[PDB]
Amino acid sequence: SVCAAQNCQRPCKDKVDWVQCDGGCDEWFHQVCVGVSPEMAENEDYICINCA
Ligand SMILES: [Zn+2]
Ligand SMILES: [Zn+2]
C-alpha cells in the first residue's frame, strides 16, 4: 500500500496520523512524506499540490 505523494517515504507507524486532501482528490498523504506538521492536521484544511 503506497499513499499519495510525489515522494512517499512509505513509513508505517501506529502513531502516525495521516492527512486527506479534501480539495478534490480525497487521497491520503503522510505528514512526513508530503511535508505536513501534526499541528496543521488538527487545525487546518490540507490542500495538496494537485488541489493547489
Ligand atoms: Zn506517504
Ligand atoms: Zn488533492
Curated annotation (Swiss-Prot):
Zinc finger intervals, PHD-type: 2-52
Effect of residue 18 to A: Abolishes interaction with histone H3 di- and trimethylated at 'Lys-4'
Family the UniProt entry places it in: Belongs to the JARID1 histone demethylase family.
Disease: A chromosomal aberration involving KDM5A has been found in M5 type acute myeloid leukemia. Translocation t(11;12)(p15;p13) with NUP98. Chromosomal aberrations involving KDM5A have been found in M7 type childhood acute myeloid leukemia. Translocation t(11;12)(p15;p13) with NUP98.
Swiss-Prot/TrEMBL domain comment: The GSGFP motif is required for the interaction with SUZ12. The ARID domain specifically binds to the CCGCCC motif and is required for the lysine-specific histone demethylase activity. The PHD-type 3 zinc finger is required for the interaction with histone H3 di- and trimethylated at 'Lys-4'.
Oligomer status and interactors: Interacts with SUZ12; the interaction is direct. Interacts with the viral protein-binding domain of RB1. Interacts with ESR1, MYC, MYCN and LMO2. Interacts with HDAC1; this interaction impairs histone deacetylation by HDAC1. Interacts with BMAL1 and CLOCK. Interacts (via PHD-type 1 zinc finger) with histone H3 unmodified at 'Lys-4' and (via PHD-type 3 zinc finger) with histone H3 di- and trimethylated at 'Lys-4'.
Protein name from the UniProt record: Lysine-specific demethylase 5A
Parent-protein start and end of this portion: 1609 to 1659 of 1690
